[PDB]
Amino acid sequence: ATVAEQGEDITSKKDRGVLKIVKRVGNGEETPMIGDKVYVHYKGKLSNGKKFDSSHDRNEPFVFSLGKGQVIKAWDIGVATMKKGEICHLLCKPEYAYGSAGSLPKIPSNATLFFEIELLDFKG
């Protein structure tokens, strides 16, 4: 409800597909470029508030190459806006996440996802 009402629309289409609230400021003024390796911790919740995934259960950072579609669209878009050490909240419409297919059983069809994401590091 906070992110839905106060979050910044960081999509190009301005369709409110990805809404962002910074929770902890990062340290660099720098954000990752496309193709940079990004290292994140994250927690994801559905709209009933139920968890669906977290990097913290293994306590192992989630690692991906930014802007290569190795992750949901909301992450390629959101993580690009983050500074090293930043934590943000992202509210993600299904079009920018798992869509009508979902990711069953954990993620229903047409689910809006809520992520808390920490950008631990990134390297070009």
Curated annotation (Swiss-Prot):
* Record carries keyword NADP: no
Which positions carry N6-acetyllysine? 13
Alphabetical GO CC annotations of the entry are: cytoplasm; cytosol; extracellular exosome; membrane; nucleoplasm
- State the post-translational modifications: Acetylation impairs ability to promote interaction between Akt/AKT1 and PHLPP1. Deacetylation by SIRT7 promotes interaction between Akt/AKT1 and PHLPP1, leading to suppress Akt/AKT1 activation. Ubiquitinated, leading to degradation in a proteasome-dependent manner. Deubiquitinated by USP49, leading to stabilization.
Name the GO terms of the biological process aspect. Answer: chaperone-mediated protein folding; protein folding; response to alcohol; response to bacterium; response to cocaine
Q: What induces it?
A: By androgen.
The compartments listed are: Cytoplasm; Nucleus
Q: Which UniProt keywords apply?
A: Acetylation, Chaperone, Cytoplasm, Isomerase, Nucleus, Phosphoprotein, Repeat, Rotamase, TPR repeat, Ubl conjugation
Q: Tell me which tissues or organs this protein is expressed in.
A: Widely expressed, enriched in testis compared to other tissues.
Taking every annotated instance into account, which residue ranges of this chain make up the domain PPIase FKBP-type? Answer: 27-115
GO MF entries: FK506 binding; heat shock protein binding; peptidyl-prolyl cis-trans isomerase activity; protein-macromolecule adaptor activity
Functional description taken from the UniProt entry: Immunophilin protein with PPIase and co-chaperone activities. Component of unligated steroid receptors heterocomplexes through interaction with heat-shock protein 90 (HSP90). Plays a role in the intracellular trafficking of heterooligomeric forms of steroid hormone receptors maintaining the complex into the cytoplasm when unliganded. Acts as a regulator of Akt/AKT1 activity by promoting the interaction between Akt/AKT1 and PHLPP1, thereby enhancing dephosphorylation and subsequent activation of Akt/AKT1.
| Subunit and interaction comment | Part of a heteromultimeric cytoplasmic complex with HSP90AA1, HSPA1A/HSPA1B and steroid receptors. Upon ligand binding dissociates from the complex and FKBP4 takes its place. Interacts with functionally mature heterooligomeric progesterone receptor complexes along with HSP90 and TEBP. Interacts with NR3C1. Interacts with Akt/AKT1 and PHLPP1; enhancing dephosphorylation and subsequent activation of Akt/AKT1. Interacts with IFI44L; this interaction modulates the kinase activity of IKBKB and IKBKE. Interacts with IKBKB and IKBKE.
Q: What is this protein called?
A: Peptidyl-prolyl cis-trans isomerase FKBP5
Q: Which residues of the full protein are shown?
A: 16 to 139 of 457
